[PDB]
A paper describes a structure:
The first step of this process is the transport of sialic acid to the cytoplasm, which often takes place using a tripartite ATP-independent transport system consisting of a periplasmic binding protein and a membrane transporter. In this paper, the structural characterization of periplasmic binding proteins from the pathogenic bacteria Fusobacterium nucleatum, Pasteurella multocida and Vibrio cholerae and their thermodynamic characterization are reported. The structure and the thermodynamics of the binding of sugars suggest that all of these proteins have a very well conserved binding pocket and similar binding affinities. While the C1 carboxylate has been identified as the primary binding site, a second conserved hydrogen-bonding network is involved in the initiation and stabilization of the conformational states.
Vc-SiaP was crystallized without Neu5Ac and we determined its structure to 1.45 Å resolution. These crystals belonged to space group I222. The structure was refined to an R factor of 0.18 and a free R factor of 0.22. However, the r.m.s. deviation between the open form of the Vc-SiaP structure and the open form of the Hi-SiaP structure was about 0.9 Å. Interestingly, a Co atom mediates the inter-protein contact in the crystal lattice. Given that there was no cobalt in our buffers, we propose that this came from the TALON column used in purification. This cobalt appeared to be ligated by three His residues from the C-terminal end of the six-His tag and Glu261 from a neighbouring molecule. Interestingly, the binding affinity of Vc-SiaP is 309 nM, i.e. ten times weaker than those of Fn-SiaP and Pm-SiaP. The structural features that might contribute to the low binding affinity of Vc-SiaP remain unclear.
Numbering used by the authors: 1 to 307
Amino acid sequence: ATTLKMGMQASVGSVEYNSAKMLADTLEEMSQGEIKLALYPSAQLGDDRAMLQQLTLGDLDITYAEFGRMGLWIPRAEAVMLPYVAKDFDHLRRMFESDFGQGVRDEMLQKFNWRALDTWYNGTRETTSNRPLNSIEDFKGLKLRVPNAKQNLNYAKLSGASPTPMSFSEVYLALQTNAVDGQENPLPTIKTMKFYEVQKNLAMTHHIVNDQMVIISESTWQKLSDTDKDIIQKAVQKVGDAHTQTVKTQEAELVSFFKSEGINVTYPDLEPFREAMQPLYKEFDSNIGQPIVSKLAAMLQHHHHHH
Ligand SMILES: [Co+2]
């Protein structure tokens, strides 16, 4: 009997939690009850940084972490979270699977005892506002609320908007009174926070593409049998396929929902946004001493291929 422990920030009822339960059920089935998964939701074991440390120490078996979040530990990995580098999740997954991604994953394993098993799509951030954003030119004068995060700030600044720091629980009222003109977040968050009640427009800016890696402690991995390793890897990939499709499906449902609420949904040309980020890309590559971002942004050879 092997009961793995999996920690996550997400709450019961969330997509992330539902996928973890699907993983538990899939492991049970595939192992005829030999592999179990116990779930520790709602950051009860700490935030992602804390749970990742538990993996390093061998005290927790599995957790979620974003590929770009590895930039905190492995500086070059931040390249994947610069705005507009990843065109979409497929592109991000290609980065994960590339020689670049393999190198980052090897370092995660060697230094921190993190074995990345898979990357799962977890949504794309989009931009709401009190006036239509038909193109990058419309960002001029836009008081755009972003979280206190470097890359979100760069998105706001380089698009030509006026970045406007502000506490998340205050945003609804700031949008309502036009103290701030817009904000940027994933579609489910926009729904949950009812930002659509106080924002007449939504722009499909696709500026930040999110994922979640599934990481297992190398301490745990090395105790598993060869066959159990394969079962876990394949269980994670199966659940990953389901998770990614669920997130994609829910995003399309959310766009339709917002339209049904009377929201004006725009699809601005994104090439000018990518062009506007070039200062940032060149700075990143210059500082790190390798053409990391330019290579990743252009890594489109297998884009949308069936593998
Ligand atoms: Co291909």
